Structure 1
Amino acid sequence: QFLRTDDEVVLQCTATIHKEQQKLCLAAEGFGNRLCFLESTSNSKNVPPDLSICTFVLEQSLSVRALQEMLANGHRTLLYGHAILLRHSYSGMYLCCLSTSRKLAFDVGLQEDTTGEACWWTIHPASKQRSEGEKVRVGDDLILVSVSSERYLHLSYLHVDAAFQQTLWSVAPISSAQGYLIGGDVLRLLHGECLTVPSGEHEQRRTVHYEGGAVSVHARSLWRLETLRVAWSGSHIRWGQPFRLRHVTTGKYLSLMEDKSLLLMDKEKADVKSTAFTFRSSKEKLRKEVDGMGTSEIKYGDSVCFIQHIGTGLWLTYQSSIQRKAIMHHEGHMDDGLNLSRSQHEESRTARVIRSTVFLFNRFIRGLDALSKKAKTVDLPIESVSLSLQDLIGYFHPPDEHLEHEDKQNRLRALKNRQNLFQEEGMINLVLECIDRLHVYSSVAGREAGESWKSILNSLYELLAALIRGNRKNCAQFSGSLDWLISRLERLEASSGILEVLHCVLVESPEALNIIKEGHIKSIISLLDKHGRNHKVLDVLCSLCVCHGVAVRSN
């Protein structure tokens, strides 16, 4: 009925695209993207909207006057005339006005810290019905004005910019019970063993499987429960309200295809009655909607949940290395009452970033495939890549020494969890393929986009190192490519970067210490003839000499 502090909402408008008011909401990605864009929620039948990166949380709603004093240095209800703070509900980035163009309107972005006036945005109705001081209700057509630039959050023609013309930003709510299922939550699917999807570089990862053991840890056992509705997506999960399932790592919707089987298909093929399921308590096939958080119905831990497709009434059963293949059938077994379990927020935060790493580098691979074969211009992102490349280093930044111990341990425990997730989806291998195709020429492409080629390669290894520095696993996963790194060691371009990967591996892989041979180490000592005098080489040779604690005397 109202809008208060700490309530998840969206910012929706319309646009005149071919006689239809395209009901589009504000979208901005994060962790790869600082800029804002549009997501149409009109075609919810065929190409349903990515509602994860559209929602925003009203972190603080204070007036203009009660802010500048605080800036010189509690579910409060929103009133018109208050400057609100719109943190992005996924990336934790605050919505701000920028200092750039896309045209004398500034641009709208998601910056990191709440300091500065750009993060705050005042609300004013464009309605003579309601005025200032009135409680902001559900679904009021309102205008968002900045505080720094004091420009309107405007829908330009098809881009978001802080302009001087106004736009009615209709605010549909999403949510506001702990331990009960809430829609929108990325979560697993337990058995008593969990539902999985095939691993990296494996089919285009489309099959559906039950699997026990250590796949519950993995990201490929994560499933986002997306409702059909735009508003009140964070309603509590009831028995029988509809849900478009969508796999996290591939970014594909779980769809019933009558031609083959239950499959993972993309955004565009997944029509509603081909992909949306519901939940049943028994295996029977006996409400439409409520507007609110709804009935706090089903638990995470203690809930035996049968899964039924809407359009056909099929049930999620299994066929039968345990790669127990899950399918859809009219009856199935009595082992279809699948228990649920939520993911942690960081677990969800990694894996959405994983699909962000996916769509970014694969365009970067295919763009590199275009200008490697023939010269002269398939879209090759550079800045978008380097923005993510810098950010992921920051994502995998180690905890500070100037941090308190227990929090440092938690962040490090978080860090390894962040690291383990990229290995088990093959992001390490994905980076490994990008280092392949870039290390071809020597500064081909457009050399303002291809100008940062030197700085891209450096930070690739600096990413690649950082995904190693803690884990005994992932360094042992460089069993294979360790000889290849010593092969590209003598590129002399980013040769410190190859070494810094190879340093931190050989601190933590007694596995790979025993791999390395004469001519490899000869080449490492040969590199010291190349690059003058680097003590960097020496600590590598120190680490090739001494293990974790023991000696390798043949070395």
Structure 2
Amino acid sequence: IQFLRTDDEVVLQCTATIHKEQQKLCLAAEGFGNRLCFLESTSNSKNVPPDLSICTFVLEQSLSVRALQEMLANGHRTLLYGHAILLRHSYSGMYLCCLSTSRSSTDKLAFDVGLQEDTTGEACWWTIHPASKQRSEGEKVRVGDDLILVSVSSERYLHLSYGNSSWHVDAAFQQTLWSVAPISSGSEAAQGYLIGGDVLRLLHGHMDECLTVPSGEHGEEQRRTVHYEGGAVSVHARSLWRLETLRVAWSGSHIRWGQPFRLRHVTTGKYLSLMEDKNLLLMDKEKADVKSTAFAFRSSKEKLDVGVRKEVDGMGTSEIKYGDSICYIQHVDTGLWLTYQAVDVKSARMGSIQRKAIMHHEGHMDDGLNLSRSQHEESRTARVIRSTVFLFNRFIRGLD
């Protein structure tokens, strides 16, 4: 019943039935470094979580064909069938368009989909159609409606092409159904309140430290280690965290107490995982299990409510703020709490001030976790940093 307004974040998923098994593949875009899009596995998120940050698009304008051709020959509106929309990538800021070159040799007449900076021409616009006979043109689109996106320039369908390794969406003449998952409704997002999908960090009330990992001067084995640090680390790229919600719809809503979410490091791309024989470390997405990587924020230290909140399909309620909101980390499996240690012996205490974060039952009653969100500039900078260091390590290995 919820209508699709303008200037709201949505995700474009679809189902592919290959090898006699169904799968839910989404549309994702790297943005920086490459132009063409690719596919993301929303399903099978039990061991491999999908990178939700790059599969989010925003509708800018919703004009008819006449108005589109008319402006082209030269507000919170509502999505209507038959109209033409403009899908701007939330992360990269570019716009989804239909490219002219070809990459999949299996389709000698189909075109590729990607991103472009300018909004000129008919490539960056996509006209919308229904996929059922119950809804005709001029009707209002609602959540869950099966739609078909057709290019305005090439007049081709946004087809889900199949390949051995070229699992790449293209612009072909065979249609493909696409489902719309809302994330942020574009409504009044409470300023100073915690919103899902944010890139933020934590600080202490009277310690002025943040949860971070060692810098790049050490190897990856030490960067996997976790601790607290102060000083210039207050403003760094290796000090930010992302709250990846397990939900695929409305993941960018008001985060409430008790719900689970992974803690991703924007610089390394790994998650805070826990095996009982050791403490918490960083591990990649290829083995990120919901059990070991799911955490939550409590308002106290007791265990009065654990399995109370199940699912809310909406924007939620503005509960958790950034400044005056003392959270407490709690694992979904062990239920332990953050504790700062004195791993540094007195022999080097005046050196690198470093207090490791061990999850335990008792803890210390002075943590006072205060949230602090990072601006779009620092978030995008950290993400692009991770991207180029990954690509450059790949190039260095390939050259060596």
Q: TM-score scaled to structure 1, two decimals?
A: 0.65
Identity across the alignment (%): 98
* CA shift digits 1:418-441 (9 cap, x unpaired): xxxxxxxxxxxxxxxxxxxxxxxx
* CA shift digits 1:158-189 (9 cap, x unpaired): x1101111000100110122221111011111
After superposing the two structures, state which structure 1 stretch, 166-175 or 203-212, moved more: 203-212
CA-CA distance at 1:6 after TM superposition: 0.5
Contact 1:96 1:108 in 2 (8 A): yes
Q: Distance in 2 between matches of 1:285 and 1:368?
A: 54
Secondary structure of the equivalent of 1:268?
Answer: helix
Q: Distance in 2 between matches of 1:35 and 1:195?
A: 35
Secondary structure of the equivalent of 1:297?
Answer: coil
Contact 1:143 1:152 in 2 (8 A): yes
- Greater C-alpha radius of gyration: 1
* CA shift digits 1:360-418 (9 cap, x unpaired): 0111111012xxxxxxxxxxxxxxxxxxxxxxxxxxxxxxxxxxxxxxxxxxxxxxxxx
Aligned to 2:228: 210
Secondary structure of the equivalent of 2:5?
Answer: coil
After superposing the two structures, state which structure 1 stretch, 87-96 or 292-301, moved more: 292-301
CA-CA distance at 1:74 after TM superposition: 1.1
* CA shift digits 1:116-147 (9 cap, x unpaired): 11110011011001111111101111100011
Q: Distance in 2 between matches of 1:73 and 1:327?
A: 63
Residues 204/365 of structure 1: CA separation in 2 closer, same or farther (3 Å cut) = farther
Q: Which has the higher helix share?
A: 1
CA-CA distance at 1:209 after TM superposition: 1.1
Secondary structure of the equivalent of 2:383?
Answer: helix
* CA shift digits 1:275-332 (9 cap, x unpaired): 1110001112231111111111100122111110111101122119211111211121
Higher relative contact order (CA 8 A, sep 6+): 2
Q: Distance in 1 between matches of 2:10 and 2:358?
A: 36
Q: Distance in 1 between matches of 2:272 and 2:19?
A: 31
CA-CA distance at 1:18 after TM superposition: 3.0
After superposing the two structures, state which structure 1 stretch, 330-339 or 237-246, moved more: 330-339
Q: Distance in 2 between matches of 1:331 and 1:86?
A: 49
Task: Establish whether residue 248 from structure 1 lines up as the match of residue 263 from structure 2.
Answer: no
CA-CA distance at 1:19 after TM superposition: 2.6
Q: TM-score scaled to structure 2, two decimals?
A: 0.90
Aligned to 1:133: 138
Contact 1:188 1:216 in 2 (8 A): no
Residues 250/204 of structure 1: CA separation in 2 closer, same or farther (3 Å cut) = farther
* CA shift digits 1:467-505 (9 cap, x unpaired): xxxxxxxxxxxxxxxxxxxxxxxxxxxxxxxxxxxxxxx
CA-CA distance at 1:268 after TM superposition: 1.6
Contact 1:307 1:336 in 2 (8 A): no
Contact 1:198 1:205 in 2 (8 A): yes
Secondary structure of the equivalent of 1:15?
Answer: strand
Q: Distance in 1 between matches of 2:9 and 2:92?
A: 14
Structure 1, unpaired ranges of 5+:
370-555
Structure 1: which 4+ aligned runs deviate by more than 3 Å? Answer: none
CA-CA distance at 1:204 after TM superposition: 5.1
Residues 19/201 of structure 1: CA separation in 2 closer, same or farther (3 Å cut) = farther
Secondary structure of the equivalent of 1:14?
Answer: strand
Aligned to 1:184: 197
Contact 1:208 1:327 in 2 (8 A): no
* CA shift digits 1:187-228 (9 cap, x unpaired): 111112211111014225111111122112101110010001
Aligned length: 368
Q: Distance in 1 between matches of 2:177 and 2:363?
A: 50
Residues 204/13 of structure 1: CA separation in 2 closer, same or farther (3 Å cut) = farther
Q: Distance in 2 between matches of 1:141 and 1:124?
A: 9
Secondary structure of the equivalent of 2:235?
Answer: coil
Contact 1:6 1:58 in 2 (8 A): yes
Q: Distance in 1 between matches of 2:366 and 2:398?
A: 46
Structure 2, unpaired ranges of 5+:
163-167, 342-350
